[PDB]
Amino acid sequence: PKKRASNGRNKKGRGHVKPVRCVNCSKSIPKDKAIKRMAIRNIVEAAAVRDLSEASVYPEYALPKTYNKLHYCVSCAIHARIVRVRSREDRKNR
Amino acid sequence: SLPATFDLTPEDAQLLLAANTHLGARNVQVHQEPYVFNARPDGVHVINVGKTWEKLVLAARIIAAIPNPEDVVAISSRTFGQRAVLKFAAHTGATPIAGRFTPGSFTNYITRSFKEPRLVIVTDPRSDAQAIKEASYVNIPVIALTDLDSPSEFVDVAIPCNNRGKHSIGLIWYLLAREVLRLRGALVDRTQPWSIMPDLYFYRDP
Amino acid sequence: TRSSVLADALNAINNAEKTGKRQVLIRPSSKVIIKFLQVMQKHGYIGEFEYIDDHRSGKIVVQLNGRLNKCGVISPRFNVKIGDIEKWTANLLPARQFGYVILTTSAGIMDHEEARRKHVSGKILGFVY
Amino acid sequence: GRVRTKTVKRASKALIERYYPKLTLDFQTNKRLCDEIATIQSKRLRNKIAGYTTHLMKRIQKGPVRGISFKLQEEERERKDQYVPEVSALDLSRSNGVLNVDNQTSDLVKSLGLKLPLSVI
Amino acid sequence: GWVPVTKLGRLVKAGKITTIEEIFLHSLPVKEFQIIDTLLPGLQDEVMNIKPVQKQTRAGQRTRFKAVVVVGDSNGHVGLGIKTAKEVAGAIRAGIIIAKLSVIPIRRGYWGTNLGQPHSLATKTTGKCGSVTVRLIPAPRGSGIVASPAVKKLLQLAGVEDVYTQSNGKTRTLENTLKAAFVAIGNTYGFLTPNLWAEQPLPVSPLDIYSDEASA
Amino acid sequence: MRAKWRKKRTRRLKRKRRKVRARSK
Amino acid sequence: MENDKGQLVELYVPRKCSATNRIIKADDHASVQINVAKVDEEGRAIPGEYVTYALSGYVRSRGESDDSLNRLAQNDGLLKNVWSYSR
RNA sequence: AGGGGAUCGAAGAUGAUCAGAUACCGUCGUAGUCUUAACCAUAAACUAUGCCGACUAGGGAUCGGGUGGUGUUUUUUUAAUGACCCACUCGGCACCUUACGAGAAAUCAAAGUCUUUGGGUUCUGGGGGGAGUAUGGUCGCAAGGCUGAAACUUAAAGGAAUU
């Protein structure tokens, strides 16, 4: 039977959308069907900022930040544990 | 008819306005309450204090119409108007249902918490929707102190009042306990000010 | 598109009854519904209704008192003999004590009960009960 | 695993609702008092049941808890219901005897009760 | 021994309430089987059948008995109830206690000739429960109750001596048929006939006048 | 066993029998 | 409803809802009865007699039960200026 | 039939793994994936919900347009513009809570105004297989498309929730 009001993923009044490619398994997934997760982690690893600071030209003030978007297929999403099966009561939560 | 002495006197208008019983909710508004009169440009809506007082005694007239002055009960699930109801429960009889409401007090006759009322008052219908819903199966009239953003279902007496405020809820509870005592005749003269103050109904922060 | 003005209008008061309306706005504004409420009001079945007239079709506002349950119109205007008046009464309306099969003849619009008193059969309009 | 079970919990609340001045805050004086009015057929069982009620007298000395009703909680409830504030009566006070209201409020006052104090800020 | 705990139990035990029409007219909340038996002594019990039901689990089955029992005198009071229990005796004894609790009056009239006592229904009535609906058509005298054997004996004790019955859907589901008829017979009073068309003063509830014979 | 395999077997059958008919007619 | 002899057969003629004239069912366990006292000059509420207000559970379902109570108090003269017939 | 022919890539050549692998995993690699002129007329071509017309509980957000409010800004504060705010309206993709109503439920403001059965109109199905097959016509260079059975066989298949 039907599982979601928005059947696949919010494909309503459109009919077709340009598919894209996943970044792990390279699956052809529609634009709105592929989940997009922001990657706003800094260019440096967790903490360790002062370690580069002591060997940093200028009084630092650089703080570069890397931004990226991740396209994941459904199979890779469950495998990466980012999105997990929710209860029927939970399923109506955005 | 009425003796026309039930007008909103300056002293009753002074405590109603100073307690902020006229301010309403935001742009969200249920179209089942045509009691609204204009709004603040910032977003605060304004209710007619005249209609709130007018329909207050209408609720009071139906509360005191019950012969036995102990069958009346009131629900306060939200801890905000907790001690207000005990003042009602201490002045003109009644049994407190303050604090937690047992789910089955209305229908089940075996539970030790089984009462049977003929008329119920609630503060926030959203906060205690269980009370009105359960009471709907025993065909009992109810009273609600709704606000322009609260639903008005399964209620035949809905008091328009502010629910987000100590000065408002405590004062409106104090009033509806005042004329019912006056209408019952325990205060004799209507023009004589009461010796009890709404701040007793107020809830202390500690 | 608009096919039967009476059918579209009559459904609104029926929907009005279902929600308990004492008033409803009807706006095909024709004669064939005007005499529909003339005979309808004759037996005190509804209240006092209002007709709005202007340069175009117009509007109907009816003050209905909440005493009705279900009213309908039978589409293809069937040709009914005198021998089928009692046939239509059994399968459409609760009994012969009440319920009036409104139908029009060459003499005008008037219910089934006095129609068999007329001993003339005409054109079926609907049923009121 | 010192958590008590249901039978001791339900039995414990049965005493204090009518035995407030007998459940002394000392365990030794009421560890055998319960046997005199509660028929317990076990020396071991009668100890923890006396222990639990004694435990609540310790906390009830500090303050009240939920759903107990020991015939004196209502006594303080009917005492703490007449606070009757003397002068801060939220009327003819908290201001210069006049409401601090808005311009739009003036329309509500003059609708039917114009004869009243007013001060639009 | 009764020692009633509810309000309606005290009035009947005191003799204030005589006939059952007062409770039906005022529609007071009543869940006590003592009142119904005392009000109408002449009630007959009937059970259609028993359909076993088992709870599938880790191992084995523990089949219960689900007994549907209808009880009603053939003069205008009938009631229906459904209950499940492990043993047959408990299931049937609980079916009566709830069916008698749910006694519903029926409006009796004619197919329409207006000489004698009521025989059949005034209007056609139906009620959809599950996927089956039953129709009750007024019938000339002498036709009898034509219906399914379970339904026809249900209407035999309803007091109506004849009715024409139409059924739709899977009528094999017996328990769905009576509840469809159970809501149908109650709906029968929900039809606004041109006879009950004058307005009458609304009576005062008997609980208010007899307030002192209530509680305490 | 899947639907397109039913269809592929049937189409193969039509091709063989069409070859047979062409060899005959 | 009447036979030829004269006796009125069939029992418990049901009440009529005050706001909208619908039949209140015996199984309809949502119909409320409202009784309002009367004032006699001095402002004291005399007991014993009330104006009877029968409201069906259909009215209460939509929440307009408060709305319906206005006109019958207004029409009976109990209320003065609450609900204006013209919205 | 040409142009084009970088990546990927039905076939295939291969390397693992497996008892077997002509599959899943890696590397090359033809047709193809791009375009021109002409055919092919198919799909989970789905909102699995035909179109037209009226009525029916509410709330907010969002696209386009319009109206009014010395509304707030935007210069040469100001004349207008432009962005917004407030209030309303029309046409929309539609959401959120409820169920008078329907539904077998999953649920639906339409899947409601269907037993109280009727607004108008087109098309499709009568147990499951056989079989969307045989044959006959018909479009197509073909692959294929449209129409479309029968014999025979079975008492079970199928839909919705539960432990």
Side-chain angles (χ1 to χ4, degrees), chain B residues 1-188 190 193-206:
Chain B
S1 165
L2 285 319
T5 46
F6 302 142
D7 69 327
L8 178 72
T9 41
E11 64 270 18
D12 309 329
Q14 207 213 1
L15 43 76
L16 268 166
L17 265 80
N20 321 299
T21 60
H22 27 62
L23 60 74
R26 280 88 201 279
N27 41 37
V28 48
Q29 210 283 290
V30 53
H31 265 52
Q32 291 324 354
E33 300 183 44
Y35 313 150
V36 84
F37 284 72
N38 64 296
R40 189 79 189 224
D42 215 324
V44 171
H45 256 267
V46 178
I47 209 69
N48 198 338
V49 311
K51 233 158 158 185
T52 72
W53 154 233
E54 155 37 68
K55 194 213 166 265
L56 211 177
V57 53
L58 204 36
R61 281 280 288 102
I62 208 49
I63 281 173
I66 289 296
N68 267 1
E70 73 282 358
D71 164 272
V72 55
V73 289
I75 323 313
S76 161
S77 53
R78 173 199 207 143
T79 204
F80 182 39
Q82 189 53 15
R83 45 206 272 195
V85 61
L86 299 324
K87 310 314 139 62
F88 192 168
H91 299 136
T92 166
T95 89
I97 331 303
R100 181 57 209 288
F101 186 102
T102 88
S105 320
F106 268 106
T107 89
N108 175 260
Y109 68 99
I110 280 308
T111 319
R112 196 60 61 257
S113 91
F114 167 55
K115 299 332 148 276
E116 61 76 30
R118 312 282 150 66
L119 164 154
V120 183
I121 310 77
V122 311
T123 284
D124 197 1
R126 269 167 153 150
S127 89
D128 42 86
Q130 262 159 8
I132 308 85
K133 262 292 270 174
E134 288 177 59
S136 74
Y137 303 70
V138 77
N139 49 261
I140 169 173
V142 314
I143 287 95
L145 268 47
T146 89
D147 154 24
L148 68 86
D149 79 327
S150 36
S152 322
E153 72 305 349
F154 274 92
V155 46
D156 36 356
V157 160
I159 294 309
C161 93
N162 170 29
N163 311 9
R164 187 193 267 253
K166 181 143 304 307
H167 255 297
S168 62
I169 282 189
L171 165 78
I172 190 59
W173 201 238
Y174 169 85
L175 265 48
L176 58 76
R178 175 234 165 254
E179 65 289 337
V180 296
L181 184 142
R182 148 75 197 93
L183 158 55
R184 274 294 311 117
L187 218 54
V188 197
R190 35 177 76 148
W194 219 12
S195 312
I196 305 103
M197 289 53 66
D199 306 83
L200 157 73
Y201 293 66
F202 285 12
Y203 156 80
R204 290 264 323 279
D205 282 348

